[PDB]
Amino acid sequence: SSNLLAFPIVQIAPQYRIQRLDSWTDSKEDSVFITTYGFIFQVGKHELLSAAMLCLGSVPNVGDLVELARACLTMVVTCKKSATDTERMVFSVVQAPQVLQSCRVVANKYSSVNAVKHVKAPEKIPGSGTLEYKVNFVSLTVVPRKDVYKIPTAALKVSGSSLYNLALNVTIDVEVDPKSPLVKSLSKSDSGYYANLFLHIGLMSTVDKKGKKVTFDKLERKIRRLDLSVGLSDVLGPSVLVKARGARTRLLAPFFSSSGTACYPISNASPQVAKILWSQTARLRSVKVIIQAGTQRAVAVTADHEVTSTKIEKRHTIAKYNPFKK
Amino acid sequence: SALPSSNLLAFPIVLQQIAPQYRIQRLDSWTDSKEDSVFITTYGFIFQVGHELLSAAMLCLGSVPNVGDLVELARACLTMVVTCKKSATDTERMVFSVVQAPQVLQSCRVVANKYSSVNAVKHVKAPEKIPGSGTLEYKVNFVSLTVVPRKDVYKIPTAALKVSGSSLYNLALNVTIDVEVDPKSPLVKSLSKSDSGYYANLFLHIGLMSTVDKKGKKVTFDKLERKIRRLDLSVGLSDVLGPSVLVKARGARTRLLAPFFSSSGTACYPISNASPQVAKILWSQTARLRSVKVIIQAGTQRAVAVTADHEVTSTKIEKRHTIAKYNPF
C-alpha cells in the first residue's frame, strides 16, 4: 500500500509509522521529526502526477504521537515548479494544524526543495496550473535534536593527496514483490534484492607521527577503536545513521556530532536509492568500511582496501506503515 | 531490436546485433565564432567482470580540434579501454579510468587527465545496481559528436545561477520536450501523454531581471515584456555536454541578463544539472523541443510560493537542434 509511493513507476488509507531513537545516544529525547509522503495532483480532471516527499522539520516531543500524525493529514499544501541551478518544487503551506506551528516549513509557510530528490517523476510535473500536494503517509522520528547532525557539504568535499577517503559500501535489503517494475534496477541475491550505496563517511591520514607512514595494521586498529554502528531511518527523509562509540581523531571530528552521531540523507547520497525507500521497507544487509585514495585522481588508479564491517543496528530500519484506527 | 537502437541506453529500463552506432551534430552555423572543436559524448554500458551488464552510462570526454574524418575520430572513440568504480565525497561518484585511448583523443580533458570522476546519478542509469567493489568495465557503444566553437558552449557558473533577491525577477523557461518512444516502452509511465505521443517537462532558470529602474520604481510589465521580446531568444537541443538545452539571445542583454550569455550570446544548460531524469531519458530516445515559454517568477523562492507566475512569450524553437537518431558504422 505504501508501495504506491513508487508512482508513476508501477481504496487507499492514510498510514503512519513512528521510529524511536531515544536509546541511540543517552542524549535526552526531545524532538519529533516529521517526514510526509504523498501525491501531486493536477487540480481540475483531478489527476495523480507523481509520488512526492516533504520534510516539515521538527516539533517538541509531547502528547499522543499518533495524534500528532493524524494532525499532519489536515495540512493543505499546494506546489509549483521553480528553478535556481536545478529544478525546484515549491510547496506553499495554505493550512496547517496548531501543533505544527513551530516546525520550519509551517512557520515559513513554504518549502522550496530540489525537484529530483522530492518528486518521483519531475518530468511529469507541468510548468503551470494549480497543483495540490496530498499528504497520505506520515513518518515520525523521536530523537534528540542534538543527535540528528547532517555533515556540512564543505566538510564532505575536503580531500588531500595524503589523506585516505573513509567510506562505507552499504547494501540495503529492500522488501519488494519480485514482480514490481523497480526490481529492474536492483541486484538480486539468493535471498532477495538489494540496493548498493557507496557513502563517504570521513577522512583518515596516510601519515603517522607527522612522520610517515600509517599501515594496514594501525588503520584496522584506528577504525575498530572508532567502533562504528550504522542504521537506516526516516528523520530527514531516508537516511543512513552512523554512530562512533570511540573518540574521533582530529580529522574525523567534523564528520560526527558532539555525541558521536551523523545522519546522511540518502536523498543527497544517492537520490534513486532514496526514492525506492519511499515505497519499500528496507534494512541494512552489510556495511563494509572501505579506505580509498584521498583524491579522485588517485582513486582511479588505486585499489580500494576493505577494512572491516560495522555493527548493523537492526532496530534502525525503514519500517512498515500502519493504517489509522477505524 | 529494430528501433532507434539507442533504446538499449535506457538499460536497465528497457522494453526488452549490439551495434556500435554514432551521430554527428554540427553547430558551425549557430554563431559567428570561428569554429574550434568537436565535443565528444560517449554512451555505453557498465559491465561486471566475473561480461555481466549492470546499467547504461554516459561519459563526456571534452573536446578535440577539428581535423580529419570525424567519422573515424568517432570510430576511434569505440576503441578505448575504460575501467570504472564507485567513490563518493558529498554524493556517490562514478570514477572512470582511461586505461588506453587512441592518439587522436589524447588532446581532450578526459584522456589527458586519464580519468574522470563524475556525479553518479547523472552518469549511470541505475547506480543502485552498481557494486561498491569488484572490477567493472565501461564499454563505449555510441558516439555523439558536436562540431561547435568552444567559445559558444558557455555553462553559466553555479553561483550565478543561484543569485536571487527581493528586487529581482527569476527569468525562466517552461520547456516541454517531445520524446519518440515505443508506446509499450516503460519510459512512458514517467512522461506526459498527448495526441502526439508523449513529452517531458523541464523548468529552467535562465537569467535575472530587475524589478525597478533605475534608482527606480517599478518597471512595469510592459517594460519587461519589451526587453524579453528584444532578447529574442532561440532555443535548441544538443548533446554537447550530455543532453543540453542551447539558448541563444539575438538581441541585446540588459545589465543583469549579461552574465547569463557568452559574448556570442549563447548559453548551454546541461540537462543533467537541470533535471537528471530527463537527461537520462534523452540518452536512449530521440527528441525535439515541443514548446518553450518564457516565464517571469518572483525573485526569491519564498516569494515564488505566494506570487503567480507570469508567462511573457514563446521563444523560437531551433527545429534543426534535436537529440538526433544514431546510425550504423
Side-chain angles (χ1 to χ4, degrees), chain A residues 1-85 87-189 191-266 268-326, chain B residues 1-90 92-194 196-271 273-329:
Chain A
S1 291
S2 99
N3 273 35
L4 216 69
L5 291 170
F7 189 90
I9 313 299
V10 277
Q11 304 140 349
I12 199 61
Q15 304 208 237
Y16 77 95
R17 67 190 179 189
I18 303 165
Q19 178 190 75
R20 323 275 331 202
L21 292 185
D22 312 36
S23 91
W24 192 27
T25 283
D26 59 336
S27 282
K28 215 335 223 211
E29 35 101 9
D30 71 18
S31 299
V32 188
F33 282 66
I34 306 175
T35 296
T36 71
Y37 301 84
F39 303 97
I40 300 170
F41 292 90
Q42 159 87 84
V43 189
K45 225 99 133 36
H46 194 83
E47 168 182 49
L48 176 61
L49 296 163
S50 190
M53 162 182 86
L54 178 64
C55 300
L56 296 185
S58 65
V59 291
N61 188 33
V62 178
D64 191 83
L65 287 187
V66 172
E67 283 306 280
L68 170 58
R70 274 199 138 72
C72 288
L73 312 175
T74 68
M75 273 194 309
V76 175
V77 182
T78 60
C79 67
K80 58 194 298 197
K81 291 270 263 253
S82 191
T84 52
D85 62 320
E87 262 190 336
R88 294 188 78 78
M89 189 86 357
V90 178
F91 302 78
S92 289
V93 170
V94 187
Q95 275 178 267
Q98 289 89 338
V99 63
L100 289 181
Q101 296 289 332
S102 67
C103 80
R104 197 190 61 262
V105 180
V106 174
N108 284 322
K109 295 203 171 152
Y110 82 101
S111 181
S112 161
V113 289
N114 170 296
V116 68
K117 289 165 183 177
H118 302 264
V119 180
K120 184 74 173 194
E123 59 268 34
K124 210 184 162 72
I125 301 301
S128 68
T130 298
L131 299 179
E132 194 198 7
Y133 161 61
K134 214 352 156 93
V135 168
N136 197 33
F137 303 85
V138 178
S139 187
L140 299 181
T141 299
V142 183
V143 64
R145 202 171 284 243
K146 315 73 96 115
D147 287 0
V148 11
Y149 178 64
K150 214 160 77 92
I151 307 315
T153 102
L156 298 174
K157 270 139 148 227
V158 181
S159 63
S161 315
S162 68
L163 300 171
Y164 279 110
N165 174 10
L166 186 72
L168 302 179
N169 177 352
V170 187
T171 62
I172 295 177
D173 286 340
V174 1
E175 266 263 21
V176 47
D177 166 20
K179 305 324 201 177
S180 161
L182 305 193
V183 125
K184 276 197 288 258
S185 90
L186 304 170
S187 321
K188 194 292 238 152
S189 106
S191 359
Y193 305 76
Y194 64 98
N196 303 263
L197 170 60
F198 198 99
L199 192 69
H200 161 70
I201 175 206
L203 257 1
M204 287 188 95
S205 211
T206 64
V207 114
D208 184 1
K209 167 173 315 225
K210 102 189 218 174
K212 324 201 353 170
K213 175 244 212 191
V214 182
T215 63
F216 299 111
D217 332 14
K218 207 154 161 42
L219 282 171
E220 204 249 76
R221 190 158 316 175
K222 283 243 239 227
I223 289 170
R224 197 148 137 261
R225 157 160 61 253
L226 188 59
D227 192 1
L228 288 155
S229 54
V230 174
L232 289 179
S233 176
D234 219 16
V235 255
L236 313 188
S239 301
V240 172
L241 302 173
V242 322
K243 184 187 163 225
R245 264 169 248 90
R248 269 67 77 187
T249 72
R250 216 113 144 347
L251 264 173
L252 274 126
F255 296 89
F256 291 95
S257 67
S258 60
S259 60
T261 53
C263 174
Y264 287 91
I266 298 163
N268 299 334
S270 169
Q272 295 182 14
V273 167
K275 309 197 285 191
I276 292 169
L277 298 195
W278 292 8
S279 56
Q280 314 309 112
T281 63
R283 34 167 107 266
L284 293 168
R285 180 179 151 249
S286 50
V287 159
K288 315 209 162 278
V289 185
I290 306 308
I291 308 184
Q292 293 197 296
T295 64
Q296 294 295 275
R297 164 171 283 110
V299 176
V301 287
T302 62
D304 287 355
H305 182 246
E306 200 199 285
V307 174
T308 194
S309 303
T310 68
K311 299 161 162 49
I312 305 266
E313 175 46 82
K314 47 193 100 184
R315 286 155 177 86
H316 298 171
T317 69
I318 302 286
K320 32 182 212 76
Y321 281 92
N322 298 135
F324 272 105
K325 10 175 75 100
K326 19 83 169 243
Chain B
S1 198
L3 295 174
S5 185
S6 299
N7 304 351
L8 200 53
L9 280 175
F11 194 91
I13 330 292
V14 283
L15 191 270
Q16 72 287 292
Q17 269 249 326
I18 198 101
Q21 280 197 332
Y22 80 108
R23 71 183 170 185
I24 307 179
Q25 180 186 73
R26 317 185 77 111
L27 294 179
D28 27 66
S29 84
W30 188 41
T31 290
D32 256 2
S33 319
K34 262 88 191 209
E35 158 113 354
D36 78 20
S37 326
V38 206
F39 285 75
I40 303 106
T41 305
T42 80
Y43 301 74
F45 306 82
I46 296 159
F47 286 104
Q48 199 159 21
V49 181
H51 250 69
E52 126 145 280
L53 189 69
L54 304 170
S55 149
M58 91 126 68
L59 184 70
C60 298
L61 309 186
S63 71
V64 300
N66 194 25
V67 198
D69 187 352
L70 316 171
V71 193
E72 305 303 337
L73 161 75
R75 218 179 232 111
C77 287
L78 278 200
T79 65
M80 269 171 310
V81 185
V82 183
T83 63
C84 65
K85 50 199 316 200
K86 295 262 256 220
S87 183
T89 63
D90 55 326
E92 268 190 334
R93 330 227 53 186
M94 202 56 39
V95 174
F96 297 76
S97 266
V98 176
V99 157
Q100 91 188 301
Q103 195 48 42
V104 70
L105 301 174
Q106 307 290 334
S107 170
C108 66
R109 185 182 30 90
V110 161
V111 177
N113 299 319
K114 302 264 224 304
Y115 90 95
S116 191
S117 169
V118 288
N119 171 302
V121 69
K122 285 162 195 210
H123 300 263
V124 173
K125 190 88 182 183
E128 64 272 35
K129 206 147 160 42
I130 287 148
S133 80
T135 57
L136 316 173
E137 286 173 339
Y138 167 59
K139 190 197 175 212
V140 177
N141 215 300
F142 287 102
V143 176
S144 157
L145 291 183
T146 296
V147 210
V148 52
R150 151 135 259 332
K151 328 186 202 69
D152 296 335
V153 186
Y154 181 51
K155 270 175 75 159
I156 307 319
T158 301
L161 288 177
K162 287 155 93 77
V163 181
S164 58
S166 54
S167 56
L168 307 171
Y169 286 120
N170 170 348
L171 185 55
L173 298 176
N174 182 350
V175 171
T176 63
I177 291 159
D178 258 310
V179 337
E180 267 230 3
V181 62
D182 183 27
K184 263 261 179 166
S185 177
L187 293 204
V188 153
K189 308 196 263 267
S190 85
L191 299 179
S192 299
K193 168 70 180 170
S194 72
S196 351
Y198 295 96
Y199 64 100
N201 306 266
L202 165 59
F203 200 91
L204 186 64
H205 174 58
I206 250 284
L208 299 162
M209 297 176 90
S210 187
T211 62
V212 289
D213 267 354
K214 163 145 46 134
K215 206 350 160 168
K217 229 186 129 149
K218 235 303 212 161
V219 166
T220 87
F221 148 73
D222 292 357
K223 308 321 152 189
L224 296 168
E225 200 185 72
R226 172 191 55 75
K227 304 178 212 293
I228 284 158
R229 268 208 74 264
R230 182 144 313 137
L231 201 62
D232 198 348
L233 291 164
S234 191
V235 186
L237 299 169
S238 180
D239 216 28
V240 225
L241 297 169
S244 316
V245 167
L246 295 179
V247 178
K248 167 153 185 176
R250 286 94 137 283
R253 273 79 71 196
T254 69
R255 209 173 157 100
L256 287 154
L257 265 81
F260 295 83
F261 303 84
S262 65
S263 52
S264 73
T266 48
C268 180
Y269 287 86
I271 299 170
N273 298 337
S275 167
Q277 300 215 352
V278 170
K280 301 208 269 171
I281 289 160
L282 314 187
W283 289 6
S284 51
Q285 323 300 115
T286 65
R288 39 192 329 143
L289 285 172
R290 153 195 254 248
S291 60
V292 181
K293 341 248 70 180
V294 183
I295 302 303
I296 266 88
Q297 285 191 315
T300 60
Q301 296 296 285
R302 161 171 244 114
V304 165
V306 298
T307 132
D309 294 353
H310 180 143
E311 178 179 327
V312 166
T313 182
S314 258
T315 78
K316 205 180 87 161
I317 288 160
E318 195 49 273
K319 89 205 73 196
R320 57 175 149 173
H321 298 173
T322 65
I323 305 308
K325 77 194 188 89
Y326 283 92
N327 308 136
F329 252 123

